[PDB]
Write a protein that binds this ligand. Sequence first.
Ligand SMILES: N=C(N)Nc1ccc([C@H](N)P(=O)(O)O)cc1
Ligand SMILES: [Mg+2]
Ligand SMILES: [Mg+2]
Ligand SMILES: [Mg+2]
Ligand SMILES: [Zn+2]
Length: 889
Amino acid sequence: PKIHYRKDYKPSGFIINQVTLNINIHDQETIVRSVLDMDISKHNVGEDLVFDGVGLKINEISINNKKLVEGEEYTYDNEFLTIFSKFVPKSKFAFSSEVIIHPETNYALTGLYKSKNIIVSQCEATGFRRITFFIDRPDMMAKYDVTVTADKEKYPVLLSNGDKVNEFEIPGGRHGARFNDPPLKPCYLFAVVAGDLKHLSATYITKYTKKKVELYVFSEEKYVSKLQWALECLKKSMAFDEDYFGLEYDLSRLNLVAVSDFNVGAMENKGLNIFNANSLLASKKNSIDFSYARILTVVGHEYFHQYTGNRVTLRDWFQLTLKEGLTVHRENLFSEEMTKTVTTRLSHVDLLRSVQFLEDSSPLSHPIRPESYVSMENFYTTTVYDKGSEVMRMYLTILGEEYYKKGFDIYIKKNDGNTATCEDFNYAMEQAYKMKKADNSANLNQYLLWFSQSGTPHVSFKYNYDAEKKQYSIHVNQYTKPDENQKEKKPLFIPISVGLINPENGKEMISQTTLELTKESDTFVFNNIAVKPIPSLFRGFSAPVYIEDQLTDEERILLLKYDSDAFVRYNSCTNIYMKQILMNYNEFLKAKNEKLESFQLTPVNAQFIDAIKYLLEDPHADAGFKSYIVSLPQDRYIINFVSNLDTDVLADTKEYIYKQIGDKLNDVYYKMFKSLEAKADDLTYFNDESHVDFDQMNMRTLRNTLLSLLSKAQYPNILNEIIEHSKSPYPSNWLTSLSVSAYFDKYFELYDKTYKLSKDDELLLQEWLKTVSRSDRKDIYEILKKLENEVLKDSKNPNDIRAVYLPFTNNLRRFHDISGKGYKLIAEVITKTDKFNPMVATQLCEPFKLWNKLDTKRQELMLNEMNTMLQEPQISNNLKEYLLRLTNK
Ligand SMILES: N=C(N)Nc1ccc([C@H](N)P(=O)(O)O)cc1
Ligand SMILES: [Mg+2]
Ligand SMILES: [Mg+2]
Ligand SMILES: [Mg+2]
Ligand SMILES: [Zn+2]
C-alpha cells in the first residue's frame, strides 16, 4: 500500500472551480451526474489528470461535452480514473460524468448510504470519491450547486449545503430540490440528506450584527420528541462562541440531523451537521444521564468546527490536529462553563491518562502531527484529538485568558477564508507571547516539539526547605522514553501550574504561578516561605505528562483534604491508590509464583480511609468528586505502571483493596445512599424537557457508585434497595439496578423487566445491551450468546455491535480468561464486521492495543488471534494496515 508523507505535500496541477451535481435517487440505484468546471494550475507540468473515484460504475465520462474512450483515452481501476494528458485541455474546461452507486447496500457508512429509511452522506475524510469523481483532498476548494431528486412519499425532506433555491415536481411521483452554496469549501464538507424527517426549530439572534439564524433539528418521526435538548445545546454553543471568542455564526440557517447508523459521534458539514442518533436525541424517560453531557459536547464540538475547521481550513490531512485538537479544546472549555461541575475537567483527564497514554506507549504511538500515513480513515485517534486538545489548552495556561483570546483572535483574523498549518497557529500564539512577556525576542519555537514528538513525558520532583532562610526549592526533571519515532527525545516546553499549601491551616502560600520548564531539569526557588509547604503540582492537570510527585501518603492526604485545586486533590488520591495497588499486586504475584501456602498483604493506609470518610461525610463537598474518590483508578491507567501485567493478579489486588475500604466504610456508604435519595431522584423537573441539572446527575452517579460497592460487598439486605431502585423513573437508576443485581438470584428477573422497559426505544435498547454486556456475571459467555441469538442477530448497526461487545471487553476477569476464549470471541466479531464496515471492525480492535503489556501467556494468546485475523484472505486494507502496525510486523 502507498505511504503518504507529510514532507511530500505539493499543490495539485489542477483547479476545480465549480461543481454542479445531480443526484437522482431510485429504488435500486442512485445515479449521480457531475459537471466540474476545471483549470490547469501554475504548478501543472503536463501530467495525466487523475481523479479519485472508489466503487463507481461509469455510464460515461466527457471533456467539453465529448465522450472519452475507455482504454485509449482513460483507465479506471475502481480507485483512480486516469485521463492521459494528451487528451487533457490546457485552459478552462469541463469534465463531466454519470456514475451509478448503491446507498441501499452501502453498509460501510462512508460515501452515500441508507440508514433505516434516511439517505445520508458521510464524506470526511475520503468518502466524497465514493459518490463521484474528484481530486478528493482538502485543499481543492470549489463552489457547489447541488440538485437532489427522489420519490416524494419516501423522501419528502431534501437537504444539502447552502440555500434551497428551487423545489419542483417530477412525473412518476418524484420531486427535486436545488441547493446553491456559492462560498468555496473542501469536498469533505459536502453533505446531502433525504428522508421523511420531522423537526423542531428556533430562531437565534446573533450578538453583534443582530442577524436572524434559523435552527432546525431533524429526526425520524418516532423520535422527534427527543430533539429538544439538542436545540438548547446549539443555542448554548452559539452564545459561548459569542461570549468567549467574540465569534458569530455567518449563515442564515443551521440544520442538525440524527441518523441511526453512523461510525462516530457526528460531522460538521457546512450548515448541515449530521449526528449519530446517540449523540443528538435524549429524553428524561428514555435516556440515561450520560446522554445529556454527551449531546452538549457533540453539538458543541460540531458548532465550534464552523470556525476551527470550516472557515479556517486545513491545507492537508497531516494538519488534522489543528482542527480536531483545537475544536476538542473549544468543546471542553464550553462543557466546563455549561456544566459548572469540577468532574467535567476530571473526566477529560481520566480519558487522556487511561486511553491516550495507553496508545502513546503502544506500537501505535504517534505525535499529534504524524509524518506519514497509509489509511486516512485510521488517522482520527485519541492522540490527535485528546492530546491535541491538551496541547491547544497549554497555550491558554501559558498565556492566560486575556492574551490567549488575543492570540486566538490573531489566528482567526489572519486565516479566516484560507487554509492553515500548525505553524500558523503557533505563530499567532507567539505574537501574544511576545506581547505578554513584553519582549519581542521571546519565542515559541521549542513549543512546536509538542507537534512532532511522540510519547508521554515523565516529570519528577525533589524538594528542599531551609527553615532558617524561609527558602523553598522545587527541583524538576523531565524525560520522554525513546520509541520508534525519535531515538533522542528533546526537552519540551512544560507549563507547571503550582500552589504551595501550608500543612498547618490548609491556606495558599503564594499567588497563581505557572513554572515554565524548558530544560531537561531546573530548580525553582521561593523566598519568604514561612513554613515547609506541601506543593500542589500541575493544578488543573497543566501538561499531558506522567506526574511523579514523590510525596508521602501523609502529604497526599493533606492535599486531598485541604488543597484548592480539584485535579490535584483527585491526583493525590489516585497516587495513594497506585502505591497501594503496586504493593499488593507484587505480594499477590510473589504468592502465585512461589505457590505460597500462606503470605501477608499490606493493608490500606488507615489515615487514607479516614480522609475518605471525612470527605464523604462533608455535606458541603461535591457529590461528583466523591464518586471519583471511592473508585480505584481505571485498569487501562494502572497498566501503564506494571510490566507483564497478569490481569487475574490485578483483579485480586483490586478486590482486596475495595474489600479493605468497604470493611471500614460500608455503613457510611449505606447511610449516604439513603440520605442522597430525596435530592438525587427529585422529579420536580422530569417533565421539563430543557431543565438539565448536572449537580443532580452527579448525585445519582454517587448513589449508583455506592450501590455497586454495597452490592459487591453483599451488605445486609441490600437486595431490598436494589429492587426498589429498579422501580425508579430514571434509566440511570433502573439500569444500575440490573448490573448490581448480578451478585443476586434476582438478576434474570431484572434482566427481563429492564428489557421490557428498553425494547421499544432503539437508543435505550442499546444502553440496556451495554448494561448486560458489562454485568459482573459468571455466566457472561452464555449471556452474550443469548444477546446474539435474541436481540443483536445480524444487525449491521455499529451502535448495536459496539453495545454488545465493547463493555464486556472491560471485564478484567472474564474477557482475559486464560483459555483465550474472550480474545477468540472478539476476533471473530472483528473479522465478521470487517466484511461490511472496516472502520468499525478497527474500532472493535481496541482491547488488543495493550497486548504487549500483559503477562507472557496472554501476550501470546492475543498475538495468535491478531495473526489469525491478519491471515484472513478477505481482510480490508484498513484493518490490515492497523493490525500490521499494532503487531510490529
Ligand atoms: N473517523 C473517521 N474515519 N471519519 C470521520 C468522521 C467525522 C469526523 C468529524 N470531523 P468529528 O471530529 O468526528 O466531529 C471526522 C472523521
Ligand atoms: Mg459501487
Ligand atoms: Mg448571549
Ligand atoms: Mg435498529
Ligand atoms: Zn471534530
